[PDB]
């Protein structure tokens, strides 16, 4: 155990170190959540231009060619399908933690707001307390004042 | 390969909800509530430290009696009233 | 990129919907209050 | 006069093209309203000392 008010200064300092990596942290997850989002519809594309290909494929009365053409896409459909509902999920859950980190940033500041106030009082009962030590009342004539542990000698 | 960057699209997202309550866990032990009054907080863990020494140097030196403050202002009484009373009869 | 896109808008919120949604509402009859006049300013 | 020759559409789009101006002029108006009143009472400070 050491001073209590010297506590509070180096655990409110290694709060605040906390608190701006939770904003990094997040900062990279609402980022992959946008690539993957891209990556997402590029993969349709390819799928869209399959099918796209697959309409004029067969213009010449090849229909066997379609037929692989389409069995190509189900691969990329089902990849679509995969990621568009994880993106359901995740898109929600995110927008729930902001609120936390909006919450705290509030608060926090508002225990700053005080914490110099009760260090002010504190060093005032401290040095105050001081006094009684050195001079106290000039008729104690008790050896805890100074000056009559000096007037005696 | 495809398998594995999908549990990487989700790591990072699982780390910030575990620091969320983490951090905002480390809340309820410096303050929690105000009115919470009780030694796990720190403020009043420090309220407590600062009326100790409040009536700790009043021992060392107690302060005047009541009978004493009551007679104070007695005295104090008749100082502003002589001077009152006078300065009626100073300027007539 | 993307990081520092997002890192930044943490630090300062962008407007609300509601407030570009009004906003627009505003300036709907600054051009409107102006274009109004402007009939009746040559009439 | 712009329109003069009856084509009201130039109209908008002039008008449009001010509310950009008129949004920096009402900026920078209120923003001269603050410094206006604080450097006087900085001058009392140095004309004091
Ligand atoms: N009006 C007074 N107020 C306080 N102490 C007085 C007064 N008059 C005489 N004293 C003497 O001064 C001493 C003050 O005690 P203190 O110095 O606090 O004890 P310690 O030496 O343990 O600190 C008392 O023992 C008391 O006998
Ligand atoms: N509205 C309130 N909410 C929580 N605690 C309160 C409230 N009002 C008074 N208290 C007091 O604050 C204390 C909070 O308990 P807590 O500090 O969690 O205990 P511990 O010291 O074991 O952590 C309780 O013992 C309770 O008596």
Do not use: C
């Not at chain 1, 010297?6 to 608190?19: K, P, T, Y």
């Not at chain 1, 990596?21 to 992959?32: F, N, S």
């Not at chain 1, 379609?66 to 994880?86: D, F, I, N, V, W």
């Not at chain 1, 050195?134 to 000056?147: M, V």
């Amino acid at each position: 155990q050491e001073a209590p008010e010297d506590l509070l200064e180096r655990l409110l300092g290694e709060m605040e170190l906390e608190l701006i990596e939770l904003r990094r942290a997040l900062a990279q997850t609402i980022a992959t959540f946008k690539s993957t989002e891209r990556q997402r519809d590029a993969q349709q594309l390819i799928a869209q231009r399959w099918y796209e290909k697959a309409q004029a494929a067969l213009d010449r009365g090849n229909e066997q060619l379609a037929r692989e053409a389409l069995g190509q896409r189900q691969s990329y459909q089902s990849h679509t399908e995969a990621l568009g509902k994880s993106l359901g999920e995740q898109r929600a859950l995110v927008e729930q933690v902001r609120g936390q980190l909006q919450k705290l940033e509030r608060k926090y500041l508002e225990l700053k707001s005080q914490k110099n106030l009760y260090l002010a009082r504190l060093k005032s009962a401290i040095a105050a307390q001081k006094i009684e030590e050195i001079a106290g009342n000039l008729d104690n004539a008790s050896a805890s004042s100074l000056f009559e542990r000096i007037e005696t000698k | 390969e495809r398998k594995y960057l999908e549990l990487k699209s989700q790591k990072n997202l699982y780390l910030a909800r575990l620091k969320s309550a983490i951090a905002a866990q480390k809340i309820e032990e410096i303050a929690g509530n105000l009115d919470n009054a009780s030694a796990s907080s720190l403020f009043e863990r420090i309220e407590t430290k600062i009326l100790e020494l409040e009536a700790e140097r009043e021992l060392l030196n107690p302060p005047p009696s009541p009978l004493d403050k009551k007679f104070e202002q007695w005295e104090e009484q008749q100082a502003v009233e002589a001077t009152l009373a006078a300065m009626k009869a100073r300027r007539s």
